[model samples]
Target: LLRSPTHNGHLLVGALKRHQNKPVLFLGDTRLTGGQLADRISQYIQAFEALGAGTGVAVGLLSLNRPEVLMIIGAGQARGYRRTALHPLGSLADHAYVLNDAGISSLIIDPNPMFVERALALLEQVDSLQQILTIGPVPDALKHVAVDLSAEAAKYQPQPLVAADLPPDQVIGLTYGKPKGVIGTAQSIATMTSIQLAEWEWPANPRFLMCTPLSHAGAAFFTPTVIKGGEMIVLAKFDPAEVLRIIEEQRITATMLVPSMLYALLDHPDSHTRDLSSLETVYYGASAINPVRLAEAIRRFGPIFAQYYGQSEAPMVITYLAKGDHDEKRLTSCGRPTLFARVALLDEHGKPVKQGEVGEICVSGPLLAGGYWNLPDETSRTFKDGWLHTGDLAREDSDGFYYIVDRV
Candidate 1:
């Protein structure tokens, strides 16, 4: 019944509650119910507020994929705060650059090997920072506020900013981009979320196995899964054996993956042994999968590959290839434009091209995100004429399918 044209419980507080008492996530062996997560998210909001985090106050999250990520996200998405999505795979210097560049006020970190050292390095240099909150045990020498996440959050009252929650059109997340960062909103996220929920064909209580990091593209699946009363299973990183084993062990029904992971899963030695019958859908994208590889994938698995095509600028669900459309003739195509997407093949002059003609892929509609975080020139260059010009070359076929030819 959540068919709102805009965001509702999909954004913040109203989010995790929909999956109440149901398994929201399985952090390794630990299963957290929706009710528990909802309470925890409010606590996270409370903690951040206690630390003086507020609307437009950028809160940097430098951690790996874990349970706390969802809570941290809620602190920004539901309440009023700016969320910075730092790449865990990026170097310490890179992380420091983003933290300093964004002028982040508070950082919630779970220290990895390089994370602690890098954060400390930034602490010495960054001037805009106000506080540091650690998820795990804090080092005595670190002089950071170590938080007990499992403890009750009632002590610190979760409060919103004095009308800090931005409207649906404002920015929800600022994704760390190399030359220029990308900004996304509740409108963009919800638009893509609706498309995914409709196109991916995930079943009731669909157990989603998340092998990718919950940053960037991987963040797209969480809300929809929870709203549908599904369970999210997380893996620290991508391991073929781990993926195979988890699918069999957990009876995972749906998952989203990059083409490389799909290739790795197919080539893994355990591929034959893993009883992956519970898998109903294998959603993949990022790059064009080889026709040969896709055929092998279909052979090994069943007819359960839904390919999506989109960019961080618009996030996910620009286009979707349904499960039944996985035939040889349409294998190379990135399926049709999604229900909410407006895709067009435009020439160098921004004019529409003829069918089966090569041009830049320009898309519009609710899925479109805001411009670069601070790079006005880059933003202006990318998004113009009321359309997001994805710098990729592609052509639309007579059958209404699109095939990406090359990058612009």
Candidate 2:
């Protein structure tokens, strides 16, 4: 049978169809099955649609790493709405600026006492905002506010819909920097990279420990796991103790951590006591890893560590250092590019550098996003011809492995 549209309703229904009984999300104390989660997402979709959210409607999302956040994002995508992630830690002024700049039509927030006042204050500044919806519970101040959808829709709604004729290359998100407007778009980077990595001689049903913030790389990893039907254990916050606890408790087979988080986990006094033997693979990146610390981690945890180097734009696994290469010699190397992508060491004039010559790392592939949001000039400068300029300085060794030297 032919596939239906890619509406938010359809995405949820499709996910439920694939993994009907599997645990889809773990938000604090609540564990939602795929079917249950899809139902919750459908309710939000109905509520948003009732509030006149459709094509070109930008919804600002402000919350922590909760399942509701995922639902809102999924719902927005399904409805052909653009959703912008608002950092909760940002000031009210910062929140207002994003809402105004993005031309946000609505704001979805977690039911926190502190956020209610800020949301209302932001509404006064951002005239484009049409409504504010709370996910968990209504705030005392806004309890009497009329909800466009029924209270039952706030709880559960079963209408299934898919996205309408949306291509995979649409602009889904904007980057942090503004004025200059250096935005990021959604491509098939996460899906492609994850699928390729999984096929690369790894264990079946790899258990993943998620510790990064859901707003960034943490959430990106979730897409691949879902696509591949793998299990994940999430940490609401990056706590070393809790990470270790989950690893021990769940016998987690794989996990990804940033360099700083890895240092904290290794330096913790309780590190010696934990039984992390089940962890067959540990991937770390997003920042430079200290060689001394990396070596010590390898000695303690065995050689199950892999290093991935690339930014969000061309999420190409530009370079990868596998478990076998986790030795003293390859400490500084970021490894060679995976099969699907290509990388070049380019100089200031956009010319490829010679062997062992350091230059800007430029990547080109299907995984790369076309350009940033609403910044044609910036996009032209960064994404020349077909390659996405990574702005990181690197040099390839005689063996073709790339070693990142510095960030431009």
Candidate 3:
């Protein structure tokens, strides 16, 4: 969907084009329109080209929630480049390790004053790192390249760029120190996004307040939000008060929060005071929440809670527990398989388990991850006989609802 004779941003740009003039992003007082985002994305592509970055190149990013990071991700869509989101707070050794592990030649980071010194010190350690691209000005003393995003686009002849031709089984996500990476592909993620949009019928331009890091679980919402022409409100950090305020102030209609964050919001002094009537959906589940807490949440906010259960490999393409299923006994369940996800509770031998019997949660569908990168053994272990072995243990009720029991 990206190819165009007169555009950039691959599919992201094309999707944004649908709402080109509409508001797309909100970072406190800062707001960006879809058209403006495409313009900035063009600049980002030009910048990457000038830096000699492209196809097969890996770049590391150490930044909080910011528009620059999102832009980089957009730019990567067509170029088939890899942008690894580095854990900024991880130890110096780990920071260096991921860079080396990912074979990142370039780095894009936010100019957070706190990370400057630590980053500068570690820059001396990684031998493979060739360039540093910061979203803002860094300390002058450090020997690095500063990426002026606002800088003019390079004087390259504009050309028609299409969506990446990468294989559908190509690897995308890289998790350091994990047993093989969480493999994904552009098509898989796109399909998952489509599923998310179809299942959660949000009102037009539903503002999504993302208080957590988009580098992890929060990313599941990004594509669907953007594709659906919804506005995304990014918070650098999570504060119960700030989140509550923004929800009321921005008239945010949707957001995803873990149970802990939900509890904090529920207990926040201003939670009840804020006018959160605009909220249409509260998609929860990075972890299972307390039944009592969830019930209270439904009572307080109305039946707007929906649970999405999945792992990084599968993303938001798993079982969906709808708002209507928030009833007592069913509230304990994680709902039925989504329309796109073919789920089966299987035994260790890869055979299907009978109903009411605990078994490994296995899935096969259009949205399952391709496989682990460079690790066939782990890939075989996780994906057997065309099914993704989730490693999560669960049982199915007689009524077709699945209940997660334990992790294998």
Candidate 4:
């Protein structure tokens, strides 16, 4: 059960049928069974194909957490199309920029009046965008719009759509570069292995809350959730109050967040009023955490905190600071290397640093990106000698715990 990018909605349908009665996803007001979601996703894929879209099509998703968004993503993957989920908070110009950069041919948006207006405005600037499909309560502006791909998709016999048989060296996702470039194939083993290790350590369940946007870390999180038979509670946007309300109302057991959101939640006076007793784990990372704030959070919520450190280049975790490590001494540490990973702090000459010495944090093993897409020079620079030069500075304690100093 690897999280193959090629497994699209049809695989989801198979999973749903295997677990017909299981709750697979919850998005806003919609709660769907695995089977139900599979059906919806297949329908949408048919619709997309009816629109003459297929492999190599670049689709843009611009919406908060919604079931339709999930369907669209699964459908696109089924057809070998590449899709990018846009940040809902992105300005119109930013949206236009991504559309132009990715050469997006179609867009799927939430029917929020404001968001729809912004997307419409971006259309003029991005000539490549040929279609826009609005989710939610279809706004009047899009009332006449049609998604006529159903017939075409239906014409093709229903069969399991597998991931593309691209060689491991093929480029996939683009990086967050000045000019976004393709993520290469050199680091696939590392990236996939890292994710596998995490999933093995913390198995998925149906009660996970997905408040993060699907654009970045959120997409990474989505893979494990589905692989583990867990139901994902998707939020269109993150709001402390709403998060608390949903946790209590939906009995959400676990969620991932950045330190900033955690800080805001702790700072909110009403946080204490919410009954978050059901929350079993809270994962945070992407930035350094304030020790004091982390301690306070643990005190308020008990020891449900876990931290991970990595990057988009290595979508899987490089290091993890588990909930148990939130103790007095290890509180500041990012935990230990995963079971299969080897971490080292090396000097400019690629020699390992002595214990407690600060140097570049390099990682080896299965969990690293394939490589930078279309940028062979950059890829070779970062991934050399079977190691990914994280460019992050860190130090290791005598007990083998790694602490990050800064990112170079």
Report every candidate's CA lDDT.
0.73, 0.68, 0.73, 0.67
Locate the minimum summed-lDDT window of 10 residues in model 3: 1-10
TM-score of each: 0.90, 0.86, 0.89, 0.83
- Which sections of candidate 1 miss by over 4 Å? 1-12, 144-165
The local distance difference test score of model 4 is 0.67
Which model scores highest in TM-score?
1
Ranking by TM-score: 1, 3, 2, 4
Worst 10 residues of 4 by lDDT: 4-13
| Residues 212-275 of candidate 3: C-alpha lDDT, one tens digit per residue | 7866544567656777768899898999999999889989988888899999999988998898
Off by over 4 Å in 4: 1-14, 77-80, 91-97, 136-172, 175-179, 182-206, 373-376
Please provide, for model 4 over 284-347, each residue's C-alpha lDDT reduced to its tens digit, 9 standing for 90 to 100.
8777788888888888898888888776656557777777667877778977766666677888
Per-residue lDDT tens digits for candidate 2, residues 31-67, read 7766676676678777776676546677777766766
Task: Name the candidate, 2 or 3, with the larger TM-score value.
Answer: 3
| TM-score attained by model 4 | 0.83
lDDT of 1 by residue, 181-296 (tens): 67777777777777777766776877999988775554578777766667789887889999999999989998887889999999888989989899998878877678789988
| lDDT computed for candidate 2 | 0.68
